[PDB]
Amino acid sequence: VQRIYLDNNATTRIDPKVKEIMDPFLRDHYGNPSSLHQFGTETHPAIAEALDKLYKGINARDIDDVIITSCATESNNWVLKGVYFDECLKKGKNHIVTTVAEHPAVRSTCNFLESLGVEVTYLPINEHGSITAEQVREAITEKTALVSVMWANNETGLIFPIEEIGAICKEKGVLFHTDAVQAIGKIPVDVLKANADFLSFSAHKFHGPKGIGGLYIRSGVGLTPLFHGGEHMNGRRSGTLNVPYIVGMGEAMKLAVEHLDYEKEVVGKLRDKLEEALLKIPDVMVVGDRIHRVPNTTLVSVRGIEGEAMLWDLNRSNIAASTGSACHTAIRLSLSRFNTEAEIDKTIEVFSQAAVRLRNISS
Amino acid sequence: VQRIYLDNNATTRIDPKVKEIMDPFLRDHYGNPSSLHQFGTETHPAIAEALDKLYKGINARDIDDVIITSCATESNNWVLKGVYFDECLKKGKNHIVTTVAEHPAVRSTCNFLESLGVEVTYLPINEHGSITAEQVREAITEKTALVSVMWANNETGLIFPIEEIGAICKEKGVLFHTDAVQAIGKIPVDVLKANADFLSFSAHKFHGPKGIGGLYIRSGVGLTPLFHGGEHMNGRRSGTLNVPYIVGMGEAMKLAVEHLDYEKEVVGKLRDKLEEALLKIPDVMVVGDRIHRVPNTTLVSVRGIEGEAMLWDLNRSNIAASTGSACAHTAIRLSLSRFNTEAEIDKTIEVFSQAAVRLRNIS
Numbered sequence A: 001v002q003r004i005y006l007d008n009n010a011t012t013r014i015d016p017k018v019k020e021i022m023d024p025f026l027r028d029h030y031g032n033p034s035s036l037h038q039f040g041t042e043t044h045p046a047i048a049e050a051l052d053k054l055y056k057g058i059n060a061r062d063i064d065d066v067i068i069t070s071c072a073t074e075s076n077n078w079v080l081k082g083v084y085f086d087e088c089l090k091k092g093k094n095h096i097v098t099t100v101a102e103h104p105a106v107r108s109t110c111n112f113l114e115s116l117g118v119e120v121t122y123l124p125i126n127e128h129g130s131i132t133a134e135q136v137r138e139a140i141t142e143k144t145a146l147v148s149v150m151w152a153n154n155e156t157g158l159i160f161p162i163e164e165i166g167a168i169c170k171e172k173g174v175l176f177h178t179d180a181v182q183a184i185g186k187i188p189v190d191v192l193k194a195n196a197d198f199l200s201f202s203a204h205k206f207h208g209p210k211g212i213g214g215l216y217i218r219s220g221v222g223l224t225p226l227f228h229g230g231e232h233m234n235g236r237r238s239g240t241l242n243v244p245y246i247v248g249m250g251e252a253m254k255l256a257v258e259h260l261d262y263e264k265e266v267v268g269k270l271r272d273k274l275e276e277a278l279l280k281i282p283d284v285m286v287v288g289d290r291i292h293r294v295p296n297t298t299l300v301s302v303r304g305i306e307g308e309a310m311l312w313d314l315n316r317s318n319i320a321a322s323t324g325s326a327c328h329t330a331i332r333l334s335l336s337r338f339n340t341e342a343e344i345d346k347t348i349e350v351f352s353q354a355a356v357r358l359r360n361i362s363s
Numbered sequence B: 001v002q003r004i005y006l007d008n009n010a011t012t013r014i015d016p017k018v019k020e021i022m023d024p025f026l027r028d029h030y031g032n033p034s035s036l037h038q039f040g041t042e043t044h045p046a047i048a049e050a051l052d053k054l055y056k057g058i059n060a061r062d063i064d065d066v067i068i069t070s071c072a073t074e075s076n077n078w079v080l081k082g083v084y085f086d087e088c089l090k091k092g093k094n095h096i097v098t099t100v101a102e103h104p105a106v107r108s109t110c111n112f113l114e115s116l117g118v119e120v121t122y123l124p125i126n127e128h129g130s131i132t133a134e135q136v137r138e139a140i141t142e143k144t145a146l147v148s149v150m151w152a153n154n155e156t157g158l159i160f161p162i163e164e165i166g167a168i169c170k171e172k173g174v175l176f177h178t179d180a181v182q183a184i185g186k187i188p189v190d191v192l193k194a195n196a197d198f199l200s201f202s203a204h205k206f207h208g209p210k211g212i213g214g215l216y217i218r219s220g221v222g223l224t225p226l227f228h229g230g231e232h233m234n235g236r237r238s239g240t241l242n243v244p245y246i247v248g249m250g251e252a253m254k255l256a257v258e259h260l261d262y263e264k265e266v267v268g269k270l271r272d273k274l275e276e277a278l279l280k281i282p283d284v285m286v287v288g289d290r291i292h293r294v295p296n297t298t299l300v301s302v303r304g305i306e307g308e309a310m311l312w313d314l315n316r317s318n319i320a321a322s323t324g325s326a327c328a329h330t331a332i333r334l335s336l337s338r339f340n341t342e343a344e345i346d347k348t349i350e351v352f353s354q355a356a357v358r359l360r361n362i363s
Ligand SMILES: N[C@@H](CCS)C(=O)O
Pocket: A009, A010, A011, A154, A155, A322, B034, B230, B240
């Protein structure tokens, strides 16, 4: 059989070179990087090279931190709860601005903080499926400890006004976090252009393994640890380093940024071919803006067929995609550098056949 | 060259069967287990088999939880901070009983909690290198939210009472956590015999990969999540599952308990050989009780050469060991595994003895 993977915003396939670079640390180089002996120090070059690729990938400076976490969910929790303790409690800045589109690792955590008494503003989405930077300016009070806005939305692919949001936060003296998991390898990410204080990412959205991520922390910015303990990561996040996955995530970041052109010029054109072909189908329409999106994502709605019905039919033909709320659920088809034009043609065909058969059965 | 690995309490080599069982999830079975399509559901049977091995490894019941964490440090932070919120803050039980012997993942987190006002009693170690169950008895007030005592000490290998301590906690209505990281695969671990509410472990001390751990939570016990979000792990710990390491850690756990007889009978005999041989050296003495220890660990002190000097010399000969606090200054912790051999121990006796006599003549 030959299956087609079009659910890359949910997770991605590890790049074969990433598997390759990880293998020696799953085998004979198993020493603890914190060890003073040869098994420990022999890992230091590869870890340093992995860190360098991570820093350069997002334009972090030598004075900034790029802290290894176990996933973007950890990074997001660490930002929100660290700021809750540092600014909301200790400084009386008991207000946070975020959006209604945020990933559950941000929204669900904010719901918890609200239960502790934090005031949380969930900025509403516009008809374009996006947030305006004016919205964050409206919502910032003199009590706002932190603004958290995702760089790109995981369901629609829509890119948010990070640069502007960062300028507004800087002129107002407010800490800025961006959950940038969906942007890595899709668009260039520059923490300096964003004026971000915090930036989250997760390797498995860009062809590294599940269960590692990163938190960028700007120089001089504090954040009470979420993992207290040993002295790992300049004392900011304790726990024995996940050597293999650090090395892999570094390589995944490098390869991601090296393929940025290809992602926009080849993968984006496969996304357009897919979307344009699917819009010749009657009742089919894109949910949200078709401009200011990452190259790999299309979220289409089909007049009477639910998203899950299309997903179940599509899965029977070994094509993997997922749902995305529409505002009844829509179909998110999300591509990568590993898809081919043959697969898009095939998906056009199977998607169309499924559409016509599910309508005929619908009445 | 032939290096000799004797620092297994710091981390271990991944068993080749563990690496083998992980590889397919690093290659073609890269689906997100939360996905409804085929790429996600195809991972379910391996995850269920992995979980089963973990439960059986610690005699957790079907009604209990074994939550997948990113390491023991997460498990410990999660226990201590979740109990701070649920009992110290929400119930006014503003007191915690632990030991001076704990891993920093416990003590340093407790020090943070002391900064928040929690009363923490760090039970002092006795001349035997252990704590008694009577000490926890004496220290329990009606304000005690939690007792946390590690099952086995990572520096001395000394086994703590646990069974009796858990009986005392249950009769007094106090939550009991044991950091059991050093016990897995070293001695049988039975959470029901321990009457543990919480039990922590980390795969890389039992020949699984770094960066994955577990937290046993007894059925019905609550613990406010450390990671809020997507509602993975029955809503208790959010973030995309690290499928390869879960499958690997399950197999590592299975292998550890299947090798318990070998650990006690062969590895234990090798540790005794090493230790007895090193006690023929003058001025040498094991730090602590030499009874009620895990089989694999010996902690030796040498008159006036500190541990670091012996480690540097030993490392030059490609033998890896680590230090340990002794109350000349520091001692040498030698921790074996099922992958060490009698040839290695002989070579190590030779090299250690030569190192001692040479460093003494220079001293
Ligand atoms: N639900 C997310 C992945 C994190 S669970 C998405 O598929 O876009």
